[PDB]
Symmetry: C4
Subunit: 388 residues, 4 copies
């Protein structure tokens, strides 16, 4: 087997088609299913896998009230084939309350962070063995992507942040070869706060659309040069911004360079990708809550500051239903690299207080060059049927 290079053009898409759904919460009401959050998807050259951070317990289990605490030492990274729900035979890949995974064409890399808030440890596991680790550099919740990292020619890159969630922090970009950290580059450019990057190969480099939790409801962009390890950053140009919370479309702005200072504090993990001058992006339907999920293309959304012309909208989850984090993954086709995304569908607390737990299921869509219709694919569980 050979290293992935992702050296094909990006597929030219017309929108997205349904790919996968796991129905986790519905199943949890009649079977033993892990409590999870922060899911994602990543694929080896043959097939796709679903990942999530467990809470060290199943849902129908008194230990499920444990999700009221943050970053417990019992959180572990779960990994199944995509569409296999997180049942009791699921492998816990490492100890993690924050993670990223990717396959370099030869083997899986897992980046797993656990331990104390002020002194966390990131473990780097490659091809089934621990190869490296790094300790917290800012003593304030070392944390990473919660979606797939990206590898080109045997070098995998991952974005990590340590420091304040509501002010300037310390973001670094790691370059990793067979599990071994070979270089670390500081964030550079005009992005002022970076969390939870959704990254994709854009040969010869890697591009990330992230979450600014401090001053911006526009999403930051991080560009990674894999050849010289140099970094650049900015903000998505689109005047239809991708973060939650955010202003209404009539009063939202982005200048491509600075955080917009519009309902900038807080946010949610999300994604977008460029296609020439245009932008494909997803976001919650609600401007203030993690409710609903929609995708669309913004004409000039990559290149034109404050562009607000959209086309090819699709509802993924209607606004009567809960969403959550979302992220990108890339899949190599015969002649092009396709872009796909997942949406975390969060159930339980804080929105639904009948139960004590918080968990999620997922829905997954992939780019298509064909045609499609409409629908809505929410979590689907009846909260009144659930164990509390």
């Amino acid at each position: 087997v050979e290293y992935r290079n992702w050296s094909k053009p990006q597929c030219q898409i017309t929108g997205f088609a349904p790919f996968s759904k796991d129905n986790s919460i519905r199943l949890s009401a009649g079977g033993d299913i892990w409590v999870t959050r922060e899911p994602y998807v990543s694929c080896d050259p043959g097939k796709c896998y679903q990942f999530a951070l467990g809470q060290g317990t199943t849902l129908d289990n008194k230990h499920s009230n444990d999700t009221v605490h943050d970053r417990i030492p019992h959180r572990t990274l779960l990994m199944n084939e995509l569409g296999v729900p997180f049942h009791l035979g699921t492998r816990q890949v490492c100890i993690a309350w924050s993670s990223s995974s990717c396959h370099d064409g030869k083997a899986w890399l897992h980046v797993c962070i656990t331990g104390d808030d002020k002194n966390a440890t990131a473990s780097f596991i490659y091809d089934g063995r621990l190869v490296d680790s790094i300790g917290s550099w800012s003593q304030n919740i070392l944390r990473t992507q919660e979606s797939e990292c990206v590898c080109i020619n045997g070098t995998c890159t991952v974005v990590m942040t340590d420091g304040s969630a509501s002010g300037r922090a310390d973001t670094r970009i790691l370059f990793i070869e067979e599990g071994k950290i070979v270089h670390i580059s500081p964030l550079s450019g005009s992005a002022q706060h970076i969390e939870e990057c959704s990254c994709y190969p854009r040969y010869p480099g890697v591009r990330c659309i992230c979450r600014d939790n401090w001053k911006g409801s526009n999403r930051p962009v991080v560009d990674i040069n894999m050849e010289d390890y140099s970094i650049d950053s900015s903000y998505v140009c689109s005047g239809l911004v991708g973060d939650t919370p955010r202003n209404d479309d009539s009063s939202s702005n982005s200048n491509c360079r600075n955080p917009n200072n519009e309902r900038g504090t807080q946010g949610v993990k999300g994604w977008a990708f460029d296609n020439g001058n245009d932008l494909w992006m997803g976001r919650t339907i609600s401007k203030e809550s993690r409710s609903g999920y929609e995708t669309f293309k913004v004409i000039g959304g990559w290149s034109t500051p404050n562009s607000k012309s959209q086309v090819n909208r699709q509802v993924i989850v209607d606004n009567n239903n809960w969403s959550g984090y979302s992220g990108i993954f890339s899949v190599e086709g015969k002649s092009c690299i396709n872009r796909c995304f997942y949406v975390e569908l969060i159930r339980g607390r804080p929105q639904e207080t009948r139960v004590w737990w918080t968990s999620n299921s997922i829905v997954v869509f992939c780019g298509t060059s064909g045609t499609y219709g409409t629908g809505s694919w929410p979590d689907g569980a009846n909260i009144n049927f659930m164990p509390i």
Copy 2:
């Protein structure tokens, strides 16, 4: 690995021998088992798999009352090795309330339809990745086979219908190479309504026996030319007709060309296959309800209009027990291609109102050139033992 061509003669059979049974409903009373319907079987060159459409829930689960709704967004295509019941470790292959799957000798193709009734999306997934999609062309429940598609020399074909269930509809035959739709042919010939085709390789082409839900209790035939994409269609000649409902054997008719207008509306998925001038077919034992299941050979059933001489009858499910959909699959042997079939055994509503749910198990038989005896292999669950 090499593309399948199915270029061997059809096995000369004397009837069918028991192959598989999954006991799903019996097991559901003491274990966590998916609620399903519309099952089928398809085999890669090494082994066979059972498929079904899940309802996003297990049976012993309050969400099992969801089956009262049609085509929910939570239906997913399940795929296990044949004989492995649909337990919680079952992979959900795609989102689907209608589906077809087949292996071309190199990889699996899955055709998965979901979304709104008036604007559905069919996704085409090949070798673990989404390759294509098509949207509804008639805005009225885009739908497909609910049994295996067929591939010859790397081209797979599948029959899809969109439009009225009780009147003229729009049926199309798709030709797909490695997940990519390369050609679409409209239905041609004398078949007037086509649903749920049970298709098999008949080298150099593909032959399907289908369900006419509008005017015929005789089953329509669709012939697919894989070399020039041309289509023909007609009706099974046999005067012993295969659909349910239908007239009794003394008053049923077919002229090979037109729907018979005998209890023609409504119907059930079924199968038959030609052997020279003769026909092997299955059908429910009851002429009005999905009760019982029998197979037999009709002498002249393929070539002679209204032929009613049968031989080699076998009871598969006695008439005191419920059946359901049934379909064909083909299995390559050393020197010939064998034909097999599955029968869906539906339990719960509408016939059994003690429970709110509807689900099924399966029984599976394969052609044999040897000898055999008698039996009856029904679902076997006691409705009074079930969770409601």
Copy 3:
């Protein structure tokens, strides 16, 4: 991969060492586990598998009272890696209320019998596909080994019986190549009733020790010539007889040729094997009940009529605990062919009437040329802890 020939000398053993135990019934009290009986073990060239006939239900399930009926259509052959208990992910290999399985070095053959008592069907499945079938020849419970068949150079042989359980019956020996019956030889020689043969390779042929359910408490022997399909038969010489029921050791007899007419009616599946003039054998400890299990070597037990000198006794299951069927399997080592055996440990009815069900677990031992101690490895479940 190449066909097995088993062309190595038999290992020279000193007794048996513990190999495997599945604890099925203990686990059934806290998990969803199949109801089974008639288990056995067989190994491919790399690893071993446990088989049993399911009852179409788990134990903690109201359908478990179904074991009061014989040969139900819901019985299926289960197959897991040895030591993996029969949980809900277990594959049902075929429909069967009587079975035999073996690997020819290239693929698995399964012989599966199901259907009506007076008109049963045996299916022959090889390399994942149905290859042949045969119908009942005496219209009285067509039945087979309930342990592994044996293959040499691509020809597998299996012993089958049809007819009375308490009088002369019709026993036939089938020779099968890649699932296809190529020859059938009638039983010949002096064995007068044959059931449930435990067969092993004894290159260039196959030897079976069986159960005479009619007139003998000594066990019949069947010798199979794989080169010309000829058959011979007789009785184990040992005056320490292997069947249950049987006379006390002080009044039991065998002349090597005829059934002994000592508590001859009824019996239990069992095994023995020759080593020169000596015999290794197992049997229940109780002379009249399926209680306990012991093994030993009989000096002159193969060649000397009525020999009663034993040595190297081991208790496998003490006489305070239930046993059941037992059978042989063979495992190829570096320089010799080893002999192993399993013991079925039956719990529930008829002996234990607190519950309505009947099921079993297994314990498995293999020949050793080393040393060993003592113990007892019974089922271990507390009947008072079980669901009824």
Copy 4:
């Protein structure tokens, strides 16, 4: 595939990073999970596996009260991929109330001991088949490592003891090739009592750090020469001793040669390894009970008698939480051999009397040359939530 030689230098580590956690007891409160104790980890050249001794039952099961008995015949060795908790699909590898396992680069060896206390049998299973066995030599609980054995160039070695737990016993070192015992060496040197060795490759030989259950709270060392089968033994030099119970750090002693006679009776399985003159070791935090777990490097801990200067301490489990046995395993990297360890986290009796059962989960760390922070990774179950 080729035999492992472990002929690389030992990785130069700075401490340990989190590798795995299984959350067994938390999961047992909401799912069917095996009752276990004496777990360990061992890896084939591709990936790691977790092992433990089952108690023939799940936890939420009335049979879980069976742990009050020692060495029941129902104990079996369980083996899953690391991080897959012991669910009902877990393979029971052999019958064992004491065990050791290792992979020689080609296949797995399992050493499994079961049977009567005064007359036990050790079975040796290699590449899926029983190859050898040995009986008790001192008639007093034949027993072995409860962690991985070690293989060099196709010869695996394992340390076994038979005899008193509180006085002089009979310890032997076995050398095994493809499952076959080829040589047995008696213990030699100054170690006076040896139990539960934690062994690692130190090319060209094998080194073990063990438990002295009689007179020492300092840990004995056993050195194994794989070239001539010669044996040496002594005690870990470090004045910070590794056994529990032990004296406090201000009053503990070791002279490298003799048991220290400081709270010497009783003990717990543990580990350490040399790096030049220094020592890496783990131990419970409590000096009297199996509470907490810590690791550190002792400067001169390998070469200098009574050395007590430590550095690089890490808390693995804080002292408010229960621990248990711990042991080493080794993992081959690109250029060096890494050392890892697991900690058994015991819940239930005798410390927690609310429940009748005793079970464990595990946490696993691996050596790192990178950096790391702090945390505590205990079992995490709420005893009040558990089935009793």
